[PDB]
């Protein structure tokens, strides 16, 4: 003491954050592509009428 | 890629199938109305209600 208290550093307390994956178990499709967009055709044909 | 000869023959397909599915629609309806109420009311546009 006097000039300065002296010390012994104990080891570091980290502490890492995440988000970890939940949502993304149901977008397991994978495509990188360069065309300008991704299109999707949608067709409904209801057979239930008499 | 289709040639207009696939598009008629796919139209085609798809409207026989639909015909006999419509039909068979009708088969269940009918059956439903008999089994349920004992009679049938058969209607439409071109045939009178009896």
């Known amino acids: 003491a006097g000039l300065y208290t002296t010390y012994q550093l104990l080891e570091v307390q980290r502490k890492l954050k995440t988000l970890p994956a939940f949502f993304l178990q149901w977008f397991p499709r994978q495509i990188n592509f360069q065309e300008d967009m991704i299109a999707f055709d949608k067709v409904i044909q209801d057979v239930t009428r008499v | ?50």
């Open chain 2, 1 to 50: 890629t289709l040639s207009i000869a696939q598009r008629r023959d796919r139209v085609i397909a798809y409207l026989l199938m639909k015909h006999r599915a419509m039909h068979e629609n009708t088969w269940e309806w009918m059956a439903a109305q008999a089994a349920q109420y004992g009679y049938v009311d058969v209607q439409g546009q071109d045939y009178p209600l009896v």
